[PDB]
Each structure stands twice: as C-alpha cells, then as structure tokens.
Design a protein around this ligand. Structure first.
Ligand SMILES: [Mg+2]
Length: 346
C-alpha cells in the first residue's frame, strides 16, 4: 500500500504491466516506468477502479448468459386412423425405454412419456389425439395398405389448426399389399408434396411392428427441434396445460399437466380455467415424487379442488385469495355468456 511500485501493484492485482500502465494513463497518473513508486492515494484509487471495472465486466457477462434460455424438448403427438397402428407405435416407443427394466419398477401414466436418445429427449403425448397448444410436432400415421382415410384427413386438419409441424409416417411398409407410392400420390393430391420430389412434406416409412424406421422418425423429430431451436425460461411465471383429469377413489381429484414455461413447485397456488388449488404433490412418469416441474415435464398433480378441463392453461398465482378471485371472475363471466343464450335469442 505505502509505498508500492507499479510492478508490485500489478502482481498484487493480477494485471499485466502494460494493462496497469494503460489504466494509469486513463487516470492521469504520471510515472516514469513500471519501476516507479505510486503515492498511496493513487494506488488506492487503482485498486478501487480495478475492482469496479471487474465488477462491471461480470455483471455484463452474467446478463449476456441469463438472456439465453435453455433448450426444451420437442413435444409430439401421434395421430391418424385408429386402425393404422398408432397404439402399436406408441407402445413401441414406450418400450424402447423399458429395454429390460431396472428393475422393475416403476411406471405411472402422467399424460406424456419421454424417449431418450443420444441426440436428445423427445416428449410424446400419451394416447393419440383424434381429437391451448400442446404439441410442437404431429406425426400423422398412414398405413401403406389402406392409404389416406377420413380419419387421416381430420387428423391433418386438426394438427394444422393447432399449429403443429407435420411428419407423415407411412406405416406397415412390410405388408404384401403395402403401397407407399400410392400414399405419396394421395399426399400430393392434397397439397403435401414429398421432399423427394422437391416439396416440403416430410415422409418417413416405418414398421411399428418391427420398429423398422422408428429411429429415423426420432432423429427427424430431434433435427426439426434443433432447427426450430425450442427453448423456454425455467424462471418465468409457471405456465402449463392440463392433459387430462379424473377422480381417484383413494387420492381424490388428480390432473395430468404438461409444463411449458417456468417451474411449478409443491405448495404453489394454481388456477386452470375455473378450477384452482394448492399443489400438494407432483408425480412424474417414473413414479417419482417431484418437488419441482420445469419446461417439458409431465406430472400428475394433487391439489385441485374441482376437475380442471383438458386443454385449460395452468397458471401460477401468488396466493389462495388470488386463486379464488381469478377462478370466480371466470365462473361469473361464463354464466354471463350462457345467460346471453337463455335470454336472447334461442
Ligand atoms: Mg387458466
């Protein structure tokens, strides 16, 4: 401190000579060389300025990082004619992760399940949809033998309405009457031109029965997820969607929720449409109790006081009172629109 030479102060602060000499020029402190002695008040000023500038750097670098949100996994729904092997595909995907279980032990149905690959994790909504936005991607399954049917065209229209990206999966490619070329013509008739022919429709041959092609579907999902670059903020206000709800004799009202933003925690108050409660417990697809559920997580939630509806947005609220006010304001507004039916003009 009193008195320090510039090369000594540099060592102490971990700076290179020329950096400290630059700083002193910025401060207007004259010196002959790095061997010169500094007045105590100059050295002190240097120490303060360097501390601050380093504070500031760090603040800045933190900000740059914090504003880059982590990846969230792609959410996928499987759709198409119920006879075209949807459940066989879902089942196949559910098994490629119980290889030869732990185990075990243990599994729960919580509305969605995860498929892990070296390239990343995919979230599949459980039970195909006939049927808020839930899925990023809809896989439209079409049997090679049967071709595009009315259920197929409804699945396509619902997926498009919901804003999902389509992947066409032509299944049963090993039946003797399998005709994928016919399916592709049917697709092109409908404005879906396969990439093969220079169009934008993604078309993938699979067999849900043997699993042939299934790894290519997963790779394609993950590639699209990399390009769309799906991300979410785990510290935003928690937001989810109800996938389904039911009564348990033993447990009471249960609901499956998929988390989209923020992180829900046990003890949080939530409102979903007109239903509300305090999260008493959350259980994931492995049957584990979780204290927290962040983006992409599907969990069974205990604590709702009435059955929430499928597709309703789950919102964090600060307290019980807020939860009751929000749910109630929605209830009396619904009655209002309904009362705009009983009166005039039925
Ligand atoms: Mg809501």
């Amino acid at each position: 401190m009193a008195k320090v030479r510039i090369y000594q102060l540099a060592k102490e602060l971990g700076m290179e000579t020329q950096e400290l000499l630059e700083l002193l020029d910025q401060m207007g402190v004259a010196y002959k060389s790095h061997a010169s002695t500094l007045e105590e008040k100059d050295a002190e000023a240097v120490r303060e300025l360097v501390k601050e500038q380093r504070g500031l750097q760090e603040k800045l670098a933190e900000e740059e990082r914090r504003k880059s949100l982590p990846r969230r996994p792609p959410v996928v729904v499987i759709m198409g004619h119920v006879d075209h092997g949807l459940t066989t595909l879902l089942d196949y995907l559910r098994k490629s992760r119980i290889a030869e279980k732990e185990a075990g032990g243990i599994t729960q149905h919580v509305g969605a399940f995860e498929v892990k690959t070296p390239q990343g994790t995919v979230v599949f909504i459980d039970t195909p949809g006939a049927e808020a936005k839930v899925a990023d991607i809809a896989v439209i399954v079409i049997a090679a033998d049967d071709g595009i049917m009315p259920q197929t065209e409804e699945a396509i229209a619902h997926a498009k309405a919901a804003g999902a990206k389509l992947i066409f999966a032509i299944n049963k490619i090993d039946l003797p009457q399998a005709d994928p070329e016919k399916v592709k013509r049917q697709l092109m008739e409908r404005g879906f031109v396969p990439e093969e022919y220079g169009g934008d429709a993604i078309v993938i041959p699979i067999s849900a029965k043997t699993g042939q092609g299934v790894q290519d579907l997963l790779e394609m999902i993950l590639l699209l997820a990399e390009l769309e670059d799906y991300r979410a903020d785990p510290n935003a206000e928690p937001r989810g969607v109800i996938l389904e709800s039911k009564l348990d004799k033993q447990a009471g009202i249960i609901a499956n929720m998929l988390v989209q933003e923020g992180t829900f925690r046990v003890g949080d108050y939530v409102v979903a449409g007109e239903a509300y409660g305090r999260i008493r417990a959350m259980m994931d697809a492995d049957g584990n109790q979780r204290k927290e559920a962040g983006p992409g997580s599907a969990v069974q939630v205990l604590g709702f006081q009435e059955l929430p509806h499928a597709g309703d947005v789950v919102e964090w609220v600060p307290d019980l009172e807020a939860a009751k006010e929000i749910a109630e304001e929605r209830k009396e507004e619904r009655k209002a629109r309904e009362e705009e039916e009983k009166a005039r003009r039925p």
